[PDB]
């Protein structure tokens, strides 16, 4: 959370494993894996997306057989600020792997080319 010290808020961060309607309302997102983040001195909050898959490994491309589900964020209460305070701000998000995370089958990337 990058708003001011005077800004408060509760947000809901969600992970819904695949197979149902992708959550568009807090009502749905609540029902899946989630964290309710209370903004304060510990500036950041972490949600762990646990390995939940039918296959033992997923593909590194879009694939419906090995789909992973839905990450989403909602307002739990609302951002509240006093007067003389910015009413808008930014949050920044980060991703990283847990210690149980692995990859295999080495391959060339599409993220670089050499036309001509």
């Amino acid at each position: 959370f990058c708003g001011s010290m005077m800004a408060t808020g509760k947000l809901l961060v969600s992970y819904a494993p695949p197979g149902a309607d992708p959550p568009k309302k807090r009502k749905e997102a609540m029902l899946g894996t989630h964290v309710i983040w209370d903004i304060g001195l510990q500036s950041s909050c972490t949600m762990v997306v646990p390995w939940i898959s039918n296959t033992t490994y997923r593909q590194t491309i879009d694939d419906s057989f090995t789909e992973g589900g839905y990450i989403s964020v909602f307002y739990q209460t609302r951002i509240v600020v006093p007067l003389s305070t910015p009413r808008e701000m930014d949050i920044l998000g980060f991703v990283s792997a847990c210690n149980d995370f692995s990859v295999r089958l080495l391959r060339d990337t599409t993220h670089i080319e050499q036309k001509a």
Partner: protein, 283 residues
């Protein structure tokens, strides 16, 4: 500890019988097959049995390279209007029929795959020209890596994809690959879809092929002639042979009885009469 090459059981000598034990009588509704041997219904002699089931072990039944595809490439004159043909094949055992029928005696399998490549070339025009010995590049492009759009574009660099540079007229190329499935076994049959159609979404959007899992299951092989264009055009074929080494199989199945029609279990009208005429009381 009973091994595939061990001799089968000896026939034991047995004499006449008159009792309440009824081996011959049974009831197949139970779902079991009566475990009988000849000494149960006739008089037998003693035979020391030497025969073994060594060649019908799963490994032995499969221990053969089977052709699964024929790839075509060329190297034309630089003056041609048509592009230089490179080949792209989706890896599968279902483009041909014989290894397919053998694997489908079973529902699931695990094996290490041995691929062997036989390459042959010929002249196409009644020229009187030449080409020099060719080198082929057989590139594995796994799902997600960039597929070649041109015989000479950047993807043939292969910094991370595995490639074989095969020289014409040398011993056929061969590599091995471990059990690479994303499941605990390969599934020869998948009774399902890769997408659930949701009500709240359009039918088109929820649609997928019956019995298909991952659209690009195992990626592709891309083959090219590395030599530059030659005045005389040469055409080549790369025949791919598949052998399943170190194999395990699960859940037996009746073999394919009517002709294959696509990668699924579908059948074509007009092919559904395998059996022939034979009279009930005719030997």
């Amino acid at each position: 500890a009973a091994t595939s090459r061990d001799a089968l059981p000896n026939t034991e000598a047995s004499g006449p019988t008159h009792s309440k034990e009824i081996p011959a009588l049974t009831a197949v509704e139970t779902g079991a097959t009566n475990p009988l041997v000849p000494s149960d219904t006739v008089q037998t002699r003693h035979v020391v049995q030497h025969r073994s089931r060594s060649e019908s072990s799963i490994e032995s039944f499969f221990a053969r390279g089977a052709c699964v595809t024929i790839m075509t490439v060329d190297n034309p004159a630089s003056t041609t209007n048509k592009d230089k043909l490179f080949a792209v094949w989706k890896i599968t055992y279902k483009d041909t029929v014989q290894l397919r029928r053998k694997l489908e005696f079973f529902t699931y399998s695990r094996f290490d795959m041995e691929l062997t490549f036989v390459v042959t070339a010929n002249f196409t025009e009644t020229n009187n020209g030449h080409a020099l010995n060719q080198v082929y590049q057989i590139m594995y492009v796994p799902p997600g890596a960039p597929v070649p759009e041109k015989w000479d574009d950047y993807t043939w660099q292969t910094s991370s994809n595995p490639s074989i540079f095969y020289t014409y007229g040398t011993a056929p190329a061969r590599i091995s690959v471990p059990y690479v499935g994303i499941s605990n076994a390969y599934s020869h049959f998948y009774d399902g879809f890769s997408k659930v159609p949701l009500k709240d979404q359009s039918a088109a959007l929820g649609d997928s092929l019956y019995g298909a899992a991952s659209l690009n299951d195992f990626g592709i092989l891309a083959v090219r002639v590395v030599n530059d264009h030659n005045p005389t055009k040469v055409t080549s074929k790369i025949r791919v042979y598949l052998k399943p080494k170190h194999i395990r199989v699960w859940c037996p199945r009746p073999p394919r009885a009517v002709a294959y029609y696509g990668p699924g279990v579908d059948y074509k009208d007009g092919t559904l009469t395998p059996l022939s005429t034979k009279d009930l009381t005719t030997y």
